């Protein structure tokens, strides 16, 4: 007993806003659907909003302080401004000056709260309608790597400066520095597993999208009714991939492949990043001891010099 | 529904909205008085325009 109209057109805190839905024409022409709204604004949704905007306010005001409260310099330098965690002289301490690490600490705490409350929102809104809870656990798998990056790897290493700064360029710098610090990240085996799964996810997404659009003349994209009886579009897709590869799938288990290929990426990445500093302080030397590095005795270096 | 609202503001308010509006305006007046006192104290402490 679920009334979808009540679920989408209710008032109050446990209800929706933007009640008269909008409509965008180019989305209707390209994507096939153009209605915008209404959006649910219940509890677990106000908390995420408020904590996310608290952290964002802190970050942007600190940007302004660094620039000097000059709007033109603010606009010029916006993409290389950041707030950085307290330096290595401090350990995991919180008694750090506001312009040397306190702002990062406050903003990151609020960000943690907001992402947890968003997970709760996904879970409860999935249960409120008639569907199962598979997006919540995918978000949990994604959040494992987030909490490794921002909370647990610095905790095991012993300093807050092992975590990224809050900025457009700061994430690229963190990636570069973390790879440089612990040997070479190409010789991290769980980085190899992560890249395997990421590239497989992109390949599988492209394949599924292309083969469903190619057979869409026979309404193959209505995957809800195709899991009860399969018509000409699904039969043609199965035959195509059988005559190409020698094996095929269903309109059901292909999305199982999708879920697990996208899930394994974050788990393997989290394991690799956590092991990166705490057990193997140098990945090229480890790969040398593990017999996976090629000799290369006489390089032709004229390629790498201008 | 519109008994307490004045005749001029009938098409805009209710009784409930009129009550909440009165609460809001009283809060704003009190806040303004406190702000004026705070500004006078802070100027007596250290003037900010020289």
């Amino acid at each position: 007993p679920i009334d979808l109209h009540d679920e989408e057109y209710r008032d109050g805190l446990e209800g929706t806003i933007a009640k008269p839905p909008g409509h965008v024409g180019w989305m209707q022409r390209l994507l096939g659907e153009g209605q915008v709204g209404p959006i649910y604004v219940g509890l677990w949704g106000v908390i995420s909003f408020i904590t996310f905007f608290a952290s964002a306010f802190i970050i942007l005001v600190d940007y302004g302080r660094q620039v000097g409260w000059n709007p033109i310099i603010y606009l010029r330098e916006f993409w290389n401004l950041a707030v950085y965690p307290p330096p290595t002289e401090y350990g995991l301490s919180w008694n750090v000056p506001w312009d040397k690490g306190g702002a990062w600490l406050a903003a990151t705490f609020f960000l943690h709260i907001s992402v947890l409350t968003w997970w709760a929102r996904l879970y409860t809104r999935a249960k409120a309608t008639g569907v199962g809870t598979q997006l919540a656990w995918g978000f949990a798998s994604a959040l494992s790597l987030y909490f490794v990056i921002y909370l647990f790897h610095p905790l095991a290493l012993g300093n807050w400066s092992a975590a990224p700064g809050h900025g457009f360029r700061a994430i690229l710098d963190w990636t570069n520095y973390v790879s440089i610090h612990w040997g070479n990240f190409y010789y991290n085996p769980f980085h190899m597993l992560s890249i395997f799964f990421l590239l497989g996810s992109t390949l599988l997404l492209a394949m599924h999208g292309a083969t469903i659009v190619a057979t869409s003349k026979w309404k193959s994209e209505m995957e809800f009714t195709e899991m009860m009886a399969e018509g000409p579009g699904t039969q043609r897709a199965q035959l195509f991939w059988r005559w190409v590869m020698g094996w095929n799938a269903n309109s059901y288990n292909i999305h199982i492949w999708a879920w697990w290929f996208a899930a394994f990426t974050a788990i393997t990445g989290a394991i690799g990043l956590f092991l990166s500093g705490t057990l193997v302080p140098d990945w090229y030397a480890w790969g040398e001891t593990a017999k996976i590095v090629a000799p290369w005795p006489n390089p032709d270096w004229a390629q790498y010099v201008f | 529904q519109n008994d307490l609202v004045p005749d001029q503001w009938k098409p805009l308010f209710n009784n409930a909205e009129w009550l909440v509006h009165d609460i809001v305006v009283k809060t704003i007046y009190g806040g303004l008085i406190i702000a004026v006192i705070a500004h006078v104290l802070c100027w007596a402490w250290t003037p900010w325009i020289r």
Binding site: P189, M228, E230, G231, N248, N250, N253, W257, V280, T289 | -
Partner: protein, 47 residues
């Protein structure tokens, strides 16, 4: 000695074997399910 360290087997070779074997077995079972007899629309009438 010509042998890798124990971490070489723990972190590199066992996961590679697991990945390859899991891919083979998952492919076998998904193709087994896909090509069985279940409700379909008759190709003659549908086309």
């Amino acid at each position: 000695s010509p042998w890798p360290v124990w971490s070489g087997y723990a972190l590199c070779f066992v996961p590679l074997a697991a990945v390859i074997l899991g891919f083979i077995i998952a492919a076998r079972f998904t193709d087994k399910q896909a090509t069985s007899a279940y409700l379909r629309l008759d190709p003659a009438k549908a086309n």
